Amino acid sequence: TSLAVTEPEVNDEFTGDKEAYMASVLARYRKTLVERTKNHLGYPYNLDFDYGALGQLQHFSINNLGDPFIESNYGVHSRPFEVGVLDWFARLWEIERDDYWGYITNCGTEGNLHGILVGREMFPDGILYASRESHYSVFKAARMYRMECEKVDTLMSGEIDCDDLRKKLLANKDKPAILNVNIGTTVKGAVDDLDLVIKTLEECGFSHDRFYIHCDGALFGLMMPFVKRAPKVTFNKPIGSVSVSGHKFVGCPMPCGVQITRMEHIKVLSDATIMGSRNGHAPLFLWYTLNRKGYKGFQKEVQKCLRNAHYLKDRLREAGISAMLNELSSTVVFERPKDEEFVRRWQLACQGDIAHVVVMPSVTIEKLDNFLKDLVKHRLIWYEDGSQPPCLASEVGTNNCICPAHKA
Amino acid sequence: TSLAVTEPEVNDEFTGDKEAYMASVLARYRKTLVERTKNHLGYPYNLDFDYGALGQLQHFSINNLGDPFIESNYGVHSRPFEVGVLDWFARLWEIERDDYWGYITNCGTEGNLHGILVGREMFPDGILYASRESHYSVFKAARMYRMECEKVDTLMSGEIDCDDLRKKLLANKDKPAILNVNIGTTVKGAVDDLDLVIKTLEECGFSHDRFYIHCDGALFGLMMPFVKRAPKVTFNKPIGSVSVSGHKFVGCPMPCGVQITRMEHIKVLSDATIMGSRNGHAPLFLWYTLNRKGYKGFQKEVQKCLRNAHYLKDRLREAGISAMLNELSSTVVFERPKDEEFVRRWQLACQGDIAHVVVMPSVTIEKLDNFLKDLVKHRLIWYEDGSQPPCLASEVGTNNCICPAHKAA
Numbered sequence: 110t111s112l113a114v115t116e117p118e119v120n121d122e123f124t125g126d127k128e129a130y131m132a133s134v135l136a137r138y139r140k141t142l143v144e145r146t147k148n149h150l151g152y153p154y155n156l157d158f159d160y161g162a163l164g165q166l167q168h169f170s171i172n173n174l175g176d177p178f179i180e181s182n183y184g185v186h187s188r189p190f191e192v193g194v195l196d197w198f199a200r201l202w203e204i205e206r207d208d209y210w211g212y213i214t215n216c217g218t219e220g221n222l223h224g225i226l227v228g229r230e231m232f233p234d235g236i237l238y239a240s241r242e243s244h245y246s247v248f249k250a251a252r253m254y255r256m257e258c259e260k261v262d263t264l265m266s267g268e269i270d271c272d273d274l275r276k277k278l279l280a281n282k283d284k285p286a287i288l289n290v291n292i293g294t295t296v297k298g299a300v301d302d303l304d305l306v307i308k309t310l311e312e313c314g315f316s317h318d319r320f321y322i323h324c325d326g327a328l329f330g331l332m333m334p335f336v337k338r339a340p341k342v343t344f345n346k347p348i349g350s351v352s353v354s355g356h357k358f359v360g361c362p363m364p365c366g367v368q369i370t371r372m373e374h375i376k377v378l379s380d381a382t383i384m385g386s387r388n389g390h391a392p393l394f395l396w397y398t399l400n401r402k403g404y405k406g407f408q409k410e411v412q413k414c415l416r417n418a419h420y421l422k423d424r425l426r427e428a429g430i431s432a433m434l435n436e437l438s439s440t441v442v443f444e445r446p447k448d449e450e451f452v453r454r455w456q457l458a459c460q461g462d463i464a465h466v467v468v469m470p471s472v473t474i475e476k477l478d479n480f481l482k483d484l485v486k487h488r489l490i491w492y493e494d495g496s497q498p499p500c501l502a503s504e505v506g507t508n509n510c511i512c513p514a515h516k517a
Numbered sequence: 518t519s520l521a522v523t524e525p526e527v528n529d530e531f532t533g534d535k536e537a538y539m540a541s542v543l544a545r546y547r548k549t550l551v552e553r554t555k556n557h558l559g560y561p562y563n564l565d566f567d568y569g570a571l572g573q574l575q576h577f578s579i580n581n582l583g584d585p586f587i588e589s590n591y592g593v594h595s596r597p598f599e600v601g602v603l604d605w606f607a608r609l610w611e612i613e614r615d616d617y618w619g620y621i622t623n624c625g626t627e628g629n630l631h632g633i634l635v636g637r638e639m640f641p642d643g644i645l646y647a648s649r650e651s652h653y654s655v656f657k658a659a660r661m662y663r664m665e666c667e668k669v670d671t672l673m674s675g676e677i678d679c680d681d682l683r684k685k686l687l688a689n690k691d692k693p694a695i696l697n698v699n700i701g702t703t704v705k706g707a708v709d710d711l712d713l714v715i716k717t718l719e720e721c722g723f724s725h726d727r728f729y730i731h732c733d734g735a736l737f738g739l740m741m742p743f744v745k746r747a748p749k750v751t752f753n754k755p756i757g758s759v760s761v762s763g764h765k766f767v768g769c770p771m772p773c774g775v776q777i778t779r780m781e782h783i784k785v786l787s788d789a790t791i792m793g794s795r796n797g798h799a800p801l802f803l804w805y806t807l808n809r810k811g812y813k814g815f816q817k818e819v820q821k822c823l824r825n826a827h828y829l830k831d832r833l834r835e836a837g838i839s840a841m842l843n844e845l846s847s848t849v850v851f852e853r854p855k856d857e858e859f860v861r862r863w864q865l866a867c868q869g870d871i872a873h874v875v876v877m878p879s880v881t882i883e884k885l886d887n888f889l890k891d892l893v894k895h896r897l898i899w900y901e902d903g904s905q906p907p908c909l910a911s912e913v914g915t916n917n918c919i920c921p922a923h924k925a926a
């Protein structure tokens with residue numbers, strides 16, 4: 110479709126027919142947005158937010174040019190808010206105000222673009238090593254920045270296989286190593302074992318001064334910190350940088366995120382942001398929610414998302430449907446709906462014969478129960494022909510599959 | 518400064534002390550934004566917009582993942598609006614629906630990043646040639662993308678010196694040419710002569726298919742089209758791509774822009790956007806304003822911005838102050854205020870001993886008059902010790918300078 114942009118009539122100042130046409134379009138649009146929001150499950154966006162308190166600020170063009178810390182003569186900005194937000198993220202990952210540098214990004218890809226660019230200026234001859242299941246932005250960065258990339262193999266879970274990382278590293282002891290570590294993969298919600306990655310690096314003869322790690326924690330990077338007894342991402346380990354998405358867990362009307370690296374790394378980048386003009390509203394949104402919820406509030410919500418993910422998985426198994434849920438994940442991978450109009454209604458994310466539900470704060474038991482009824486109901490129709498579902502052990506592991514051959 | 522993020526008390530659910538604290542902070546903030554907006558002149562942002570009509574849409578997380586044209590399973594998006602906006606920009610630069618590809622960017626730098634990346638995948642061995650006064654994003658892109666860059670010299674106006682481009686091109690006939698053409702330079706509001714650039718290229722033996730041009734029209738790229746008798750940027754010339762900023766002329770609460778290239782070029786890129794998640798509100802804002810104003814409305818406002826720029830220049834000269842205003846520009850370059858707290862109050866953009874006022878739609882004669890009074894008043898104070906204002910001819914040309922030595926040229 111398209112909604113054309115047509116010239117107003119010569120009469121328009123008298124008749125107001127444009128504003129009237131547009132009002133209906135927007136009304137119609139809004140209605141469809143409301144229902145799409147209601148019935149969304151597939152993507153890692155928290156749809157539950159109230160920024161009514163920021164209502165009176167929405168009409169200014171707030172723009173944080175360049176560095177959050179350097180001042181600029183453009184006065185319509187929100188740097189004090191940005192800095193407060195950054196400080197909070199620094200404290201979260203155990204780096205002191207004076208050691209870190211960071212900024213609020215447009216999105217998850219920008220974070221990956223920034224961290225990887227940093228890695229490259231650290232080690233201009235570095236190879237980029239990354240899981241095959243790391244996000245496409247990682248590989249795009251390699252192409253954009255003209256870097257050799259070595260795609261590491263993956264376990265069933267979607268984790269990086271650190272044994273294949275050994276092979277790769279050893280074969281390239283010649284040159285330094287730039288790593289992309291996934292804190293929650295797009296597809297299976299896998300968490301690369303940071304510690305085993307660091308371990309592998311050292312015992313392949315890469316000392317700290319000869320590698321750089323970016324942690325892409327878009328989704329789960331903000332959730333893991335609040336999981337008790339979970340390997341921490343922290344600048345107390347040889348971590349270069351961490352990206353995380355605002356529009357994912359926090360819930361924002363605009364996409365945004367937070368890139369945090371070390372001060373030392375940013376001087377060796379000698380304006381250190383990928384983008385120039387930066388949406389000064391994003392800092393306000395993040396400032397308001399962090400202030401409102403705290404470590405405490407985030408803890409509650411993470412625990413709930415895990416509980417509800419575990420609920421969804423259990424309930425799928427009981428219904429006969431094979432499903433999987435990694436540790437350190439709110440994302441449930443189950444067998445793809447057959448009629449993929451059901452996929453579009455529920456805005457599910459699909460690949461091969463698998464689909465996933467990312468359980469965010471906005472995803473509620475009521476809404477899961479609604480999904481489950483409508484799934485079971487449409488399952489009967491899809492498979493009334495005596496036809497059976499696909500076997501799923503290829504995708505998810507035999508220990509997780511329920512097909513006739515497995516019930517394992 | 519900073520506004521700390523502090524944990525709520527254990528009591529907070531009962532007392533609501535956080536929401537109360539924050540309300541004052543936001544109130545205080547808003548008040549300062551109101552006055553900063555009122556008295557802003559230096560930067561190329563139109564501050565005059567009413568998107569009250571879009572008020573009821575502000576609470577959804579609208580996200581146009583990847584390609585405007587490809588569908589995605591995420592249903593909270595605004596692709597139909599984006600496409601409508603793109604079509605409008607395609608028509609503006611004389612390229613048909615089926616020939617062009619484009620998207621709505623986060624900003625001007627993103628457009629430069631995209632167009633230059635396109636140039637590179639066209640000519641992996643290309644040299645990037647760009648004016649010295651092209652925006653720093655152009656040079657960042659070269660570094661990011663590991664490209665040889667040849668900084669071309671500039672005339673006094675701020676235009677690319679096409680004679681120095683000859684020299685540079687001829688010295689590198691071996692390899693193809695990727696050009697960045699400025700439709701309105703950050704500092705002097707110069708317009709690179711696109712035609713003379715194309716001309717120079719051809720008569721240095723670069724046929725089409727051995728060069729790529731990106732037009733960075735961040736500011737003026739949207740204004741020039743509505744200037745009568747102005748060299749057109751159009752896909753009817755050997756143009757690769759054109760970037761333009763929403764938050765500049767149109768006026769937006771969030772930064773955004775429009776990158777438009779050719780379909781052919783994007784297949785040779787084979788997801789073709791720099792960024793992944795894309796703010797789906799930006800398309801709505803652009804859709805609403807384009808629909809509301811049209812070619813007609815844009816014409817009015819451009820003509821007004823020129824008139825008012827010319828007003829400001831005239832008035833500066835009368836007051837004794839040396840100033841310059843290129844044709845094809847709403848940006849007035851005059852002698853930098855001495856006490857640069859006056860600079861911060863008026864949010865002026867400064868470099869060496871020069872400063873500029875970018876006359877956008879929101880910049881009004883009343884507001885210019887206010888600026889001029891307050892300038893003249895503070896000038897007397899700055900210079901009542903027999904100390905003199907700077908000479909400016911280095912920066913702007915002797916034909917534009919009024920200092921004692923130059924009144925007589």
Ligand SMILES: *Cc1c(COP(=O)(O)O)cnc(C)c1O
Nearest residue numbers: 216217218244293295327793794
């Ligand atoms: C979707 C995704 C991204 C990309 O982030 P955007 O906000 O879409 O730019 C990065 N990392 C992961 C793990 C993702 O799932």
Ligand SMILES: *Cc1c(COP(=O)(O)O)cnc(C)c1O
Nearest residue numbers: 385386624625626652702703735
């Ligand atoms: C400021 C500017 C840009 C950069 O655009 P952003 O919106 O700040 O990313 C590009 N080109 C010109 C001519 C500029 O003046």
Ligand SMILES: [Zn+2]
Nearest residue numbers: 500510512515
């Ligand atoms: Zn099986």
Ligand SMILES: [Zn+2]
Nearest residue numbers: 908918920923
């Ligand atoms: Zn002079």
